[PDB]
Design a binder for this molecule. Structure first.
Ligand SMILES: Nc1ncnc2c1ncn2[C@@H]1O[C@H](COP(=O)(O)OP(=O)(O)O)[C@@H](O)[C@H]1O
Ligand SMILES: Nc1ncnc2c1ncn2[C@@H]1O[C@H](COP(=O)(O)OP(=O)(O)O)[C@@H](O)[C@H]1O
Ligand SMILES: [Mn+2]
Ligand SMILES: [Mn+2]
Ligand SMILES: [Mn+2]
Ligand SMILES: [Mn+2]
Lengths: 415, 415
């Protein structure tokens, strides 16, 4: 064309605006990790469903006050008691056991002294209550934690272990959630060999497919490996159609600059009839990053055609692809987390906004983490990149950023 | 006993010191995510393996300087060229294509003007070189990025997508790594019903098993569901033996306090013959947290018997279990990441160090995140807990922490 230089902000907003939210499905709660609820979840039981002891000790009548009491029996966990505590009496309780009728408080064993037990030692007979219990003391009334009819999880909730536990608690074992996107990845280039291949003259190994697939899998999404496609329109079109058939998202790398054998934009526009929203981004690296949508049968397929350069591919995957996938799986605010960090080294600014993988480290008591760019100590190289340095365009004023200065870092890995 | 109150530091150090590092195994590189290399990895080829163009343009003799040149042919990606560029000649090159013999520089197409092409438009015949190229300009010599024999990944490296990509690049598709721990989880209590069950009198649903399993699975480790075990020594012993047989790690919850039917410590010591290293921790919550090891046939099994209270169970799982699992899978420094954050609310300190799940949020330009404790707005409850507030013991001086004050937060989720 060549396509107009799209600002990073416009590119990003465009990606998020044009990316659809996937439909819903019912899953088992155990499979809920990373999923977004598409329904409100309601409790059908009280928690606790019975008045429950907070302590190991004795269920008592507060009105009896302190004194020596006969132990008429035991309320054990999982058993509904049958006896009624009368004045002068108490019942042994364990944590979480039901409070028997007639008792209105629990006194913990520490606030008691044992008077009499069986010759065996099996059974407590008589106990001294040393304190004045307040009514309701150390008891969880019915519904104290969760009431029947209460909404315990709202739609839009991004679920982790505790939410799964809550679902378990209220017995809601099937829930409606957004689907996860199925993401197909292909590499392009006549020069590319499989990782498993010995080198041949003029060839190199395909690395982008592995890196991109791993990046997507790290976020929990199912993937499809479309292999290596040669630099020619027919094969590219066929591969793209396959991806379209098998997946919600297609990621390609390579062939998006203006070289003689860079065919992706051509194929996307002319042959696939997709709508290219941008074909160049004013960013370093990632200049030729291309974003397209294809509407078939009321379904929007999304296509990221990333640059062939490996660094560019992984960086742009992290900047554009992951947020899109996050929106598709129903996350309401799909933006990545951005944090403030101190630069470990000086850095020259480019007229384009710059992006670089880094490692975030927190030092013993210093409030801000340090961001160390990868590529350039022993222990540091044994850590995977967990940040993406986001450096601003140079200006007539500011030309270079110095060690210790605060910059924005996008989180791309567990810290 | 009751077991001595173990300080948090001592408990943690004890866990890490007593936890073994698992043996190694060979995996396919695609399965490398989250794995730790147990070997150094060496490149057997140069990258690039041929002198490679950095630009789309023309391979030239720098000594010819600027001027009009005949295009004798094309070096295309994946093809070893055969022709030799002579004085007055150039060859078209695309990015990553081999540099033909006789050429010592590349001039990008922007620094040229096309003079003559074929009547078809298929083929460039004559081009004007507008610049004086420096020798070696825009060429990657053989081995520039990676040299044959170079160690590209060191043992001890915790791998993410980029490492997998590097493995792909150097064609090392099988690697030695540490095994992942297999983790078995059981719940205990006569009062517990499965999540799938309707409630019966005196009963509640088992939530800990789901929460703990989900927590472990979130970190990538395979798990085994040992179900619900009643409060009695025989069944507990059988379940424990099953876990021992099927797994490297056993997590139980419940039955570790001093209640009448709390049998875990007894069973662990007397019946299983495990070595309990601590049975109480001076912490809130998690007082009765119990840690044991069992050495069989030169293999150390590790057992975490966590408190029954759900909050206690998830908190202590995050404080003690995950770091242990991180050590077992070969991570050299298994400590979790701790960050500084500002409290969103005032909080009373306890004589014990306090721990609470929270949500970390970064505000637009403020350097430090805010930590909001869970449980007590609309949008915030739709986010999973990603932090664990670590609050210090109260002192005669400091009794309460105030809004805005900086505290330690342990990262437990993607931010
Ligand atoms: N798996 C579980 N799910 C939900 N609640 C549980 C679970 N296990 C125990 N509890 C509850 O936690 C509380 C403490 O149980 P207990 O077994 O006495 O813990 P401890 O380990 O302190 O002895 C009780 O109210 C009990 O019902
Ligand atoms: N999958 C891949 N793995 C490793 N290197 C690649 C891959 N795809 C492309 N490359 C390399 O990246 C560079 C740019 O390739 P190209 O397809 O021209 O990218 P662009 O998208 O900028 O046109 C070339 O040197 C090429 O060999
Ligand atoms: Mn290419
Ligand atoms: Mn190209
Ligand atoms: Mn119990
Ligand atoms: Mn107990």
């Amino acid at each position: 064309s060549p396509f107009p230089l799209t600002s990073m902000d416009k590119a990003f907003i465009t990606v998020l605006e044009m990316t659809p939210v996937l439909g819903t499905e019912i899953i088992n709660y155990r499979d809920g990790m990373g999923r977004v609820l598409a329904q409100d979840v309601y409790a059908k039981d009280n928690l606790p469903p019975f008045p429950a002891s907070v302590k190991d000790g004795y269920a008592v009548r507060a009105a009896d006050g302190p004194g020596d009491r006969f132990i008429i029996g035991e309320s054990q966990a999982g058993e509904q008691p049958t006896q009624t505590v009368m004045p002068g009496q108490v019942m042994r309780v364990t944590t979480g056991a039901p409070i028997p009728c007639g008792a209105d408080a629990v006194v913990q064993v520490e606030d008691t002294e044992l008077i009499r037990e069986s010759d065996d030692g099996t059974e407590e007979l008589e106990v001294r209550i040393l304190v004045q219990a307040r009514p309701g003391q150390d008891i969880r009334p019915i519904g104290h934690d969760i009431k029947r009819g209460e909404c315990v999880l709202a739609k839009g909730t991004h679920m982790g272990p505790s939410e799964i536990g809550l679902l378990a608690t209220v017995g809601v074992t099937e829930v409606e959630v957004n689907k996860f996107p199925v993401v197909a990845v292909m590499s392009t280039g006549n020069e590319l060999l499989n990782p498993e291949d010995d080198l041949l003259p003029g060839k190199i190994r395909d690395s982008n497919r592995s890196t991109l697939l791993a990046t997507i899998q790290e976020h929990g999404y199912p993937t499809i490996n479309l292999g290596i496609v040669g630099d020619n329109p027919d094969d590219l079109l066929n591969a793209l159609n396959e991806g379209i058939s098998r997946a919600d998202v297609i990621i390609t790398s390579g062939g998006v600059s203006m070289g003689e054998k860079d065919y992706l934009k051509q194929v996307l526009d002319i042959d696939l009839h997709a709508q290219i929203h941008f074909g160049r981004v004013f960013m370093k690296p990632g200049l030729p990053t291309t974003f397209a949508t294809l509407d078939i049968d009321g379904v929007r397929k999304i296509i990221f055609a990333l640059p062939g350069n490996p660094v560019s591919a992984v960086v742009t995957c992290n900047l554009f692809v992951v947020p899109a996938l996050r929106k598709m799986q129903g996350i309401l605010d799909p933006r990545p987390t951005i944090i403030k960090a101190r630069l470990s080294c000086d850095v020259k600014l480019d007229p384009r906004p710059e992006y670089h993988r880094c490692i975030l480290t927190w030092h013993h008591q210093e409030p801000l983490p340090w961001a160390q760019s990868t590529g350039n100590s022993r222990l540091m190289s044994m850590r995977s990149a967990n940040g993406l340095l986001m450096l601003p365009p140079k200006t007539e004023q500011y030309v270079e950023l110095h060690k210790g200065e605060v910059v924005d870092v996008m989180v791309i890995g567990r810290l």
